[model samples]
Target chain A: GKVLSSSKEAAKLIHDGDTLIAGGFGLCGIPEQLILSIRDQGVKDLTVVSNNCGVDDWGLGLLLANKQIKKMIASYVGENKIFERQFLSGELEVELVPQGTLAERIRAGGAGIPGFYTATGVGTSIAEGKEHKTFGGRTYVLERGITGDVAIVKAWKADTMGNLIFRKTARNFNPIAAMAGKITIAEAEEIVEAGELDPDHIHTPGIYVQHVVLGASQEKRIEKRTVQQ
Target chain B: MKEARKRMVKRAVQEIKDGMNVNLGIGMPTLVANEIPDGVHVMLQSENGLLGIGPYPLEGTEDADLINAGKETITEVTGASYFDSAESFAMIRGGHIDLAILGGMEVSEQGDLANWMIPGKVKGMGGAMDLVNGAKRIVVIMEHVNKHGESKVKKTCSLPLTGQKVVHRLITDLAVFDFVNGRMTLTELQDGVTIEEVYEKTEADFAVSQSV
Candidate 1:
């Protein structure tokens, strides 16, 4: 497949009300270029699945500010004041999962596990109305996975065939999400000709990716840092 | 102590004893707050910034700003204090906490605790290493056995350890055990349970408490 010239052209496939699984944790590894393109397209009623919704004005927060997302399936609801305000004001629908469970559920979805039992969210409000079973006298709750309609991911490098290699924290949700989506799109820092990347260095095989858009510019924001006094 | 584990937790409020500083760990230890006795002034110190924590708030009434170490939304008690991660840990590492209750995956015969990691699963110690080593009186609360029906009070742990020989006392659903003289001694047993039954399942030698 020929590489898309710009993120704007790559985002044209997305439509209103599409369930989009955004790949990232905190501000790390998010497809900022594609996200901005989605914002520019002015799509509405999107259901986003991610860790946090990015900061208030960046990342997924941009779509949030534009009132684009109808619902969010996330673990943590903080870090974005706009998300908090919309949630508190009954303008947004949020399904919050335990961080570890959410991660496992996505991984399980990618691994073809329909559902699994865990004690992580049992015996609390998180367990309310969920099927509870005692395994070895310890109670566990059943949690389902979020298999999205489309998965948008960011990667460090990729071949023209769409095989991807993620760098560091950018690997957060990209690889697993690439597996669970009906259609997976990737934005890579560098897009080379087919067979340009070594077989071992490919983090996500091309078979899972449907489209490739190269990221010519990136903000690469650092969410947190510590310094010696 | 299944009943005690359940009921004592409900009456743990009586143990608060007013104006005492306390730290609560994850799992069974966190349940102590749900059973807090009335009129007792106790301040809850959470590793994740919250201090003087209260019970879970009603839905739609929660303050997203207020959360515990587990990241669960909680109500703030009157006169509660807040600090960042570093200062919150300073109180823990400084030995200012009067009592701390934690959970463990396994408590060895020599009182070594292994709770943070499972082999070939999740790695990283989180805060268990600091809590085990820093707290003054560390109380471990957990179930008696593993999911595979194996005893957790083992002669030695098969799981990766968080701390070696750091646990003080273990309170489980089946019995209460104390580490004394480098071995686990049965301090209390659940009703209708015998020392023989405990010893049969446990990999360690059990000695009946003289006080019992």
Candidate 2:
């Protein structure tokens, strides 16, 4: 039940060729400190699962810059230029999932469910070669639950026991990723005492997280800083 | 081009009823809010983890973190609540939203949608697949043709499909159409736009409604 002393030590948990799942919505809830340490380790040929590959020079972009990622299982690469460049050049392998199905697949893995069916990608290329079953006359395709050998996430606050609380949009894919990993490491902005947090406010209980590292000050970027003129 | 788009959106917003939950895809569909009717209790859902989303904040009043799916800075109504991204997508995939207004690149008479990938261009579909499959009904707000003067209304989508046979209504610059049982019925034409013109540009088989 001891929290790790440094982010660099947490990086040692990730081995080369591990199927890693990262928690973030674009760059919002990224485990930046842990990611930086992993980049410094220069582990290669990683197969990553995420909602979106981060923008250039931020979030998972650091890993892409180090040429660590071999495959990306993600919904899309919306604002990330490096992801696009690598994808088109055949340097990267991509399996693009529908946004909701991807989220549910992770949630299902955490819930201990093996597989489920949904109608989201029925007529698209996403459904090609997948098992299809009919429910109440509508077709639903089978999607397997996704789990990872290593999962890294960001949280707003955590107790020493690893109970986590997440901030607004920053709470995106973090909780489910924490549950589905063999060894889940969490980096929190604030590390509080074990008994300090209220029971109902806890987003993910301590059982899901194996290690906690206090995060450094983050440099959060606005994906689209729009103004009405 | 601007006036034609405004005409489409103005006509499209009439489909949304009071006390309905709606999700608007980015681009032309986002303009539907500019002409919302007074006293309609429409709750907007964004897949980026927000509900009761309000319109664009006034210039210089930007909240960098507060954004819709399209990444525009927006405010929310008095009773708005924010949640994690997982919950937001749950609301979508669970079919809790009443309606979805989305922009499309190509729509078939059978209502198969193709809006995300475009061959050599495009990153991927954002949340359009879930929205199309889960919303109770869909109203497409799109241009009549592409910049290359190709028909977006087709017998079958040449681009990659988003979902199968889910579209309910089509609101376009030249005309309005209703899809059912694998056919498109031309319901209403914009004033001064000829049926002959719609026929010449349309790639799908369509019929004129008695009401039109």
Candidate 3:
């Protein structure tokens, strides 16, 4: 019931200035076609949240190059030079969270928890201006949950009902991102019939996803290809 | 310098106990992965999403989807399992990781750490803060001195901090220092390294171990 005609149709669901939560670690597991479609749509001032923006010339970096992003809420952005330049030039606003905290925050949002205390960022710049509490002699900082206007994720396989199964490490942020979205779109390399996927093995339940689109042949570019000599 | 770095990595590798879950940070600390001793196996936890991380993938066999936290192409061992970032990090933030060996820019006498950002060059803090805070044992690996020959082990960190009193041990090219009760003590010296050299190179006040 959730299958979409194309990535372009999925991109139409996202609009300018929307908070877009995406799934990826570096260039891996990103909804490539949906992001490209978003860029092609010329949507601007979008706030993007992910673990890292992609490297230059690929993935989300393409959108950064298009200057479609107004802010990025992520754990790391070291691989993207455009991110550095834009952030340093005051063209971008970044809220850098510790990776675990970022993950739990998104998970909390999806699970309907408003805020939680974490020891991850305690005694660092990240804890600044945040509420701090001590528990049994240890201190923790309060971090709020994150939810977005739309969440886009890449999946290895999906059934018509929007149940997803991710392959390997590509599964990183997709499941959580799917949960934290008002509307979640899953772009799958292969889309199958409703009963094709086993209920026990589904990574993202159909309940969390609203749209599923078959992605075209993906380049699946490698960001760093280190081979042992 | 390469030999000293090799010594540092080798020393860092000895910290691994069989069946422990270890997380290695990016940069020099990642070298500990290669030097892990045989017969002692530990699950490598990549904050990006994989456990049981293996070596670099063979040429032409790399899976773009399978990578370590550093974003480098990698293979997985037989028992490897993949999970979402939230679950992967739950292993970390829940204190399931046994050890975290991390690269550092500066460490204080009180075992505080500053490594993630420089004022103008802002590469966002990745998982360093979380690892330092959550891992059972935290070891920092870096050069003893900066390019200007100033000690990176300082009385206090001058830059923005990643965490406070989070480092359990510090491994530099020159020596190994442990923090016990928040007191920095030089525990071991690299080969051919003299206590005089360590004393001169280090700016932070530290106790000389009786055996060292």
Candidate 4:
């Protein structure tokens, strides 16, 4: 049975207390309509893993504003002051992993590697009194992959069978997350019939994807802006 | 004074002998790479996972995948090595670096650094916090004054601190200074600039370097 429809229709699968992994780096090519659909569904107590929680009034910040996320595992908390406030107030649990480690963890998870070791956070607050061991006389920190119940990703194009191809920075976290989910749903800007795309250019294989939704309109935002003074 | 800044950087470039591993931080410190003496084969290690970095590529010759810590596309030199972040930071923390040139916003008399966060500003702490604490020989490069018309070489920084008494040398627009016995000593003053003028802008006590 293939679940195929709109983002709102696919977002109904999300439930309270289910760990959800939403894919996007900063504000680039996020599944805004699907995230809003999840917000509209009032799914609570979600443990969200992402690069940033998103800026205020948009992206994952909307969920943080609505108090839907219970925990956050991220590398950088840049602009979203509400996320910082909630974490500081003890209303939310936050774990700050190193930027590269977070990226590798997601990549390793999709690659079917259970747990990998690295030397990134071996000392200081990141590794304070954690399980540490020496391998070949060099210390390494153990990082586990995040397993989410549902992974929601946005792609530039996809076939009816859910083979996804992302564009630019949108490809950052989407493909890895699409593989690490028990149930993966992809929202694409263009949903073409199967065999329309070349096999070489297909970024994410169809085997990892379970559902497909069409998103005809997109609003791509820049992560940062610097103007000439 | 600008000529003095160039001279101090050229002097530091002399310390970089052939076959040495080096890391360059952002801003004025980055200018040192352009002045590397020919036939001196120094390996430039960029933390964004590039090794053996060359000068900026000509137009239409840039490699999209080859980028530095600033994410600016660059050209790759021969014998260049590509690696992930894990191995990159390991080299920094493992003391494999021969020298590291960093840019600073403020440096105290005791060599304490405040380079990352500025109060109520758009930027926050980036990799500078780790590079200050990790690199072997930390050389700081900056202008002597702040944009608001104040001295950056201070008795103590008003900004949030990044490193505690770890800087080895300082190169500013006015002069070159070094830290010895937990105090900043003027190594070389730019021609036509008196010691009193340097002292007036600086909040720290100054002494002439014996070597200079």
**In order, what DockQ does each candidate have?**
0.03, 0.61, 0.85, 0.12
How high is the CA lDDT of each candidate model? 0.71, 0.85, 0.90, 0.72
lDDT of 4 by residue, B1-212 (tens): 56746765775676677888898876566778888878998889876455787776666554433455544555567898754344455667567877888878889988888876676662333345456656678788777877787999998877767666768888777778989858889987656566778878888776777776
lDDT of 3 by residue, B1-212 (tens): 78768878888998999999999999888888887778998899998888889999889888888988888999999799989999988889889999999988899999999999888657878888889998999999888988887889999899899999999999988999999978999999988799999999988999999897
Docking quality category of candidate 1 according to DockQ thresholds? incorrect
Give the TM-score of each candidate.
0.55, 0.95, 0.98, 0.63
Which wins on TM-score, candidate 1 or candidate 3?
3
For B129-171, candidate 2 gives per-residue lDDT tens digits of 9999999888898898989999899998999998888888888
Specify the highest-lDDT model's number. 3
Q: Which candidate, 2 or 4, would have the higher TM-score against the true structure?
A: 2
- DockQ versus reference, model 3: 0.85
| Candidate structures ordered by DockQ, highest first | 3, 2, 4, 1
Question: What DockQ results for candidate 1?
Answer: 0.03
Candidate 3: Cα lDDT at A136 = 90
TM-score of chain A of 3: 0.97
Tens-digit lDDT track of model 1 for B1-212 = 46746843543333455777888876677878866666777888866555787776665554433456554656677887654333455566557777778778888888878876565443233345556656777678777766788888888877766666676777777677777657778887666577777777687566778975
Listed for each candidate, the true contacts retained, as a fraction, are 0.00, 0.61, 0.91, 0.01
Which stretches in model 2 have alpha-carbon errors above 4 Å? A216-218, B56-65
Q: What is the interface RMSD of each candidate, in Å?
A: 15.1, 2.2, 1.1, 6.8
Select the stronger candidate by DockQ from 3 and 4: 3
